[PDB]
Design goal:
Chain A: It is found in: Cytoplasm; Nucleus; Mitochondrion outer membrane. Chain A: This is Ubiquitin. The complex is a heterodimer. Chain A is α+β, with helices and mostly antiparallel strands. Chain A is built from one helix and six strands, in the order ββαββββ. Chain A has a five-stranded mixed β-sheet, covered by helices on one side. In chain A, β3 and β4 form a beta hairpin. The radius of gyration of chain B is 16 Å and the shape is globular. Classes of the chains: A alpha+beta, B alpha/beta. The structure holds zinc ion (ZN) (2 copies).
Chain lengths: 77, 185
């Protein structure tokens, strides 16, 4: 019921449809559905803070049109 | 002079890679390599006149084994890249004892970088074989296979061709440019 943006370190901006009650975990699942990135690779940063999976957008008072920042985990083998 | 395209016909912008980067990376991580520990770095840079320039090799806080390496503090990594306006253009890592190829872990990692930047490259160094390669997934077919892959196991194989070396010549051009190494460890 609201739109937020997810900005990458690659010059890409993702638009997501979310609700205040969505957990960060849910937001990551939505990013997976839309963009193909597994949730365990995603870290989401907002206003100098890394957001935690069990918290909701409402917990952080994240308003519509807000921009979250995505940094990927790196794993090599 | 060069127009590079993905397997699906999408134009790829040039990435200029300093010819010194591979050797410098091996020098910087050599103590890890000698202990039979993998190490990774991020290829960071800038977009200028529709081309990417790698300007910074960033060694993030990480943990490793003889078979894996991985970042541990991506929030600090973000903060560094954000402050200095550096794009993520790719990554590099060592195979201290293995041949040069993209492993299962490499493919699942790189897929996400390449989805976020069609030009993203993975550089793999195999110092015990004196070999190296610069890889990317087939786009769109390899990316689709990895996105849908639900095969369990850290080291599972894949069916079909999923990845390829970058072409010579192609969208990655090795040149005599400056390089800064940033060690955040
Ligand atoms: Zn590897
Ligand atoms: Zn797989």
């Amino acid at each position: 019921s609201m739109q937020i943006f997810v900005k990458t370190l690659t010059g890409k901006t993702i638009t997501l449809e979310v609700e205040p009650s969505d957990t960060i975990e849910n937001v990551k699942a939505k990013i997976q559905d839309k963009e193909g990135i597994p949730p365990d690779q995603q870290r989401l940063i907002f206003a100098g803070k890394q957001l935690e999976d069990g918290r909701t957008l409402s917990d952080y008072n994240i308003q519509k049109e807000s921009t979250l920042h995505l940094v990927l985990r790196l794993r090599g083998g | 002079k060069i127009h590079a395209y993905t397997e699906g016909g999408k134009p790829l912008r040039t990435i200029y890679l300093p010819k010194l980067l591979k050797k410098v990376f091996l020098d910087v991580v050599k103590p890890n390599t000698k202990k039979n520990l993998e190490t990774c770095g991020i290829l960071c840079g800038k977009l200028r006149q529709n081309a990417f320039f790698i300007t910074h090799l960033v060694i993030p806080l990480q943990e490793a084994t003889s078979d894996t390496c991985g970042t541990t503090d991506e929030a600090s990594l973000f903060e560094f890249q954000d402050k200095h306006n550096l794009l993520t253009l790719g990554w590099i890592h060592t195979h201290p004892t293995q041949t040069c190829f993209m492993s299962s872990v490499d493919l699942h990692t790189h897929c996400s970088y390449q989805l976020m930047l069609p030009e993203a490259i993975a550089i793999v160094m195999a110092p015990s074989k004196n070999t190296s390669g610069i890889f990317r997934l087939l786009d769109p077919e390899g990316l689709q296979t990895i996105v849908k892959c639900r095969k369990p196991g850290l080291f599972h194989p894949h069916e079909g061709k999923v990845y390829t070396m970058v072409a010579q010549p192609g969208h990655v051009r090795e040149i005599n440019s400056k390089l800064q190494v940033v060690d955040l460890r």
